[model samples]
Target: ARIRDVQGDITEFQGDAIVNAANNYLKLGAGVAGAILRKGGPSIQEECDRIGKIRVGEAAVTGAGNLPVRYVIHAAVLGDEPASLETVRKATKSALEKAVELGLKTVAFTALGAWVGGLPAEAVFRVMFEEIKKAPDTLEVTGVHGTEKSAEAGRRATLEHHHHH
Candidate 1:
């Protein structure tokens, strides 16, 4: 039902699931993945290590560790080098499908493939929303990543758009 853009961390978001801009190795470090793992705790990585390597542009799901959300969709792509747009495109699509499969109504996203992956911001944002908007009009995105200070300091959340099937 909704998609949003927010300027902050994504680990602290409370929702059914949150997307991590992860690598194929599922190594949780730097950018969105690092922040998520850092807050979510070692259990997340421990689970990922158990899951093993996945194909690029694919995704895997894990428990949220210490995070408030129930699950974290590790959207695996190249996060440390220049990744193909298809890297994010497929990862984004798969992440959406995983969320839908999990029966999650509210999912939050970080900038997939844009951080250490070296993707262009405007282009990554465009591709990100492009895939999200195609989610059969059935998903509700609830938040951006943040912390106690970010929330206590009164971070402003803006609802950019809403649609329904």
Candidate 2:
């Protein structure tokens, strides 16, 4: 399928897999981790905890459980210590490569808004997107399929406005 973009809550995105901007310990703290735990149930946390700590620039896979996706790819983009913009970039790329290595065609990313090594969202997005674009065309890519509540709201607003007119 052709690559596309959609706006919605990231936690609610349905796909074969979802990517988590997890720390080395994979704790269910605030941000994307919290949201997934809330929806997918604490089992998700338990499964992740079982995997123990993952090294930076590395990723681990786990069952999706109750989430829409079949699996969750926990990418350790940040360690317990501070991270750097380059680290985030490398982590994102590594995670995507891992997904492809696993033969997954579709995946979603969350926690882009969360601070990683003090880098802003825009910078991270730019670097990540550029890397994705440079990736082999054989690989399918979709950005933020569903992560921002405002995206769904915007779609509803557009529909309502058209209906009223």
**TM-score list, all predictions:** 0.78, 0.77
Q: Give the lDDT of residue 113 in candidate 1.
A: 32
Best by TM-score: 1
For model 2, what is the C-alpha lDDT against the true structure? 0.69
lDDT of each: 0.71, 0.69
Candidate 1: list runs displaced more than 4 Å.
79-82, 112-116, 142-165
Model 1 over residues 29-84: C-alpha lDDT tens digits?
76666777788889999999999898878899999988888998988767443367
TM-score of model 1 (CA atoms): 0.78
Give lDDT: candidate 2, residue 101: 80
Supply candidate 1's per-residue lDDT for 98: 94
Clashing pairs in 2: 8-147, 8-148, 9-146, 9-147, 10-147
